[PDB]
């Protein structure tokens, strides 16, 4: 799925 704003 969408997850372009990064990892956390």
């Amino acid at each position: 799925a969408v997850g372009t704003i990064g990892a956390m």
Epitope: A1, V2, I5
Partner: antibody, heavy 121, light 108 residues
């Protein structure tokens, strides 16, 4: 656990509104925050989401250049700026945390009580 | 964009009925779909994610399945609390999109 949003707002056409959203009971910088709005009687519309740790954002294409997501980590608060308001922006604005399992969108876990925005002369 | 059609939009059923809601996706969204329940006056509540996994605290009467473009949500036996409006949502590409919603009303 809990997302607390700011109070209702009444604005004239062409004005701007700043809604705020504060996080409680979990690490503010551990989950993306979505922004979703609902016009009186209608369905849900996604505005964008923000990485509270980095401030990175993706704003929904329909609203790019008109809606701005920011955050203040020192007080676990996220901000949504909606500019150049028309009557099409009247409705309730929600902030919602994403579970973000696997570093990837999964579902909107925790919602705020919502902020009402009325655009009218 | 990428639209989700919910069928039916309005549904009347009485307490204890088994009911099934359908979400159809304009494009393939492999498994990346969620279901929400919203009562008037509230923010939505998450019921299902990964198209079929129950969110913590959701009663077992709720269940859902779905593959690619056809998804369904089912309540085995409706309860007073289950009467509300239900939305599907995908997260396969930008922008995230919700279905138009299904309002489930008490038949009397």
């Amino acid at each position: 656990k809990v997302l607390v949003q700011s109070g209702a707002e009444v604005k004239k056409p062409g004005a701007s509104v700043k809604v705020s959203c504060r996080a409680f009971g979990y690490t503010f910088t551990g989950n993306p925050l979505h922004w979703v709005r609902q016009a009186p009687g209608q369905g849900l519309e996604w505005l964008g989401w923000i990485n509270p740790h980095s401030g990175d954002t993706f704003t929904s294409q329909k609203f790019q250049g008109r809606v701005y997501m920011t955050r203040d980590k020192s007080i676990n608060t996220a901000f949504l700026d909606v500019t150049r308001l028309t009557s099409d922006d009247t409705g309730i604005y929600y902030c919602a945390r994403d579970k973000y399992y696997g570093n990837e969108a999964v579902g909107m876990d925790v919602w705020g009580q919502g902020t009402s925005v009325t655009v009218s002369s | 964009d990428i639209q989700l059609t919910q069928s039916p939009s309005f549904l009347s059923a009485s307490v204890g009925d088994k009911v099934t809601i359908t979400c159809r996706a304009s494009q393939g969204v492999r498994n990346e779909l969620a279901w929400y329940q919203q009562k008037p006056g509230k923010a939505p509540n998450l019921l299902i994610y990964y198209a079929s996994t129950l969110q913590s605290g959701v009663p077992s009467r709720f269940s859902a399945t779905g593959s690619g473009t056809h998804f369904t949500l089912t309540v085995s036996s409706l309860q007073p609390e289950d009467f509300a409006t239900y939305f599907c949502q995908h997260m396969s590409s930008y922008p995230l999109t919700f279905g138009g919603g299904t309002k489930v009303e008490i038949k009397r």
